[PDB]
Amino acid sequence: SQIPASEQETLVRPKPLLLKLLKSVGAQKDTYTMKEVLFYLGQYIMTKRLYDAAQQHIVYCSNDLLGDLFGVPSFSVKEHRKIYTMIYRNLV
Ligand SMILES: C#Cc1ccc(CN2C(=O)c3cc(C(C)(C)O)ccc3[C@]2(OCC2(CO)CC2)c2ccc(Cl)cc2)cc1
């Protein structure tokens, strides 16, 4: 959408705690495409109900490993470059 397709399709190696998160929702490898990392992050967010009906575009990740990894208590799913940057902080 806001992120170039080529950037989305690149192979990445998560750092250990990001890998822990992905493994907790069924991921079974050491390397992923960015798009794959984003999918499993999505499944994690939905599993842990890190959302709210009053603000439907906001991930509420405070007091959660995702919050610790991203360094924020919440963020908007519309901020695609900001999300990519938060993910790059968690890649080898
Ligand atoms: C940059 C970027 C980017 C932003 C959003 C998405 C897709 N998703 C969304 O639109 C989205 C929206 C919400 C709420 C209910 C809060 O609106 C929760 C989670 C997601 C998310 O996953 C959707 C999925 C898997 O595809 C579980 C079904 C998501 C995934 C990872 C992240 Cl880091 C954030 C959101 C993908 C990439």
* Domain residue limits, the chain: 5-89
Q: Which helix (H) or strand (E) holds 60?
A: strand 58-60
| C-alpha to C-alpha distance for 46 and 13, rounded to whole angstroms | 23
Residues having CB closer than 6 A to ligand 1 are 3, 38-39, 41-43, 45-46, 51, 56-57, 59, 77, 80, 83-84
Q: Give the technique used to solve this structure.
A: X-ray
Give the residue among 85, 87, 82 at the shortest CA–CA distance from 36: 87
Helix (H) or strand (E) holding 59: strand 58-60
Report which of 60, 90, 89, 63 is spatially closest to residue 77, judged by C-alpha positions: 60
Ligand 1 atom showing the smallest separation from residue 58 Cα: 16
Assign domain 5-89 to its CATH architecture. Answer: Orthogonal Bundle (1.10)
Give the whole-angstrom CA distance, residue 58 versus residue 76.
Answer: 5
Cα–Cα separations (whole angstroms), residue 72 to 13, 51, 63 = 22, 14, 10
For residue 59 the two structure tokens come to: 């991930």
